[PDB]
A = this chain, B = another copy of it.
Amino acid sequence: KKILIVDDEKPISDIIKFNMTKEGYEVVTAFNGREALEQFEAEQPDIIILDLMLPEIDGLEVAKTIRKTSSVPILMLSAKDSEFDKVIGLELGADDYVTKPFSNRELQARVKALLRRS
C-alpha cells in the first residue's frame, strides 16, 4: 500500500517516511499543498498523512479539494491541538487527527486502522 506524506518540516517527514517504510508501505512525500495535490493525482495513494499548516495551499483546502473527487482516507497531523482545530479538520474531511509530537507506534496503528476500514 502507498502513503502520501505531506509535511513541510523535512525532519518530521523523514521520521514518518522511515517508520512507514519499516512497515512495508511505499512512501511518496510532498512538502506543500500544491505538491500534495499533484502527488495525489499522479500517485493515487491509499492513504495521506496531511498536516494542517502547509505553504502554498493549507491542509484544510487540500483535504477539501481532495474530497471533491476521492474518499481516500486522510489522517491530519499538526502541532495545533485545540478543540476547534481537530473539529474543523474532521469536518473538512479528515478521518483522524493526530497531534505533534506523536508516538511512532500510535501513528502506525492509526494508519492501520484507517486502511483496514477502507
Contact of A61 among B60, B61, B91 (CB under 8 A): B91
Question: How far apart sit A66 and B61, CA to CA, in the bound complex (Å)?
Answer: 19
Main secondary structure, interface of A, reads helix
- Tally of this chain's copies: 2
Residues of B within 8 A of A64 (CB): 91
Kindly supply a per-residue 1/0 record for chain A positions 37-63, scoring 1 wherever the CB is within 8 Å of any chain B CB and 0 otherwise: 000000000000000000000001100
Kindly supply a per-residue 1/0 record for chain A positions 16-43, scoring 1 wherever the CB is within 8 Å of any chain B CB and 0 otherwise: 0000000000000000000000000000
Residues of B within 8 A of A91 (CB): 60-61, 64
Task: Jot down 5 A-B pairs with beta carbons below 8 A, ordered by A.
Answer: A60-B88, A60-B91, A61-B91, A64-B91, A88-B88
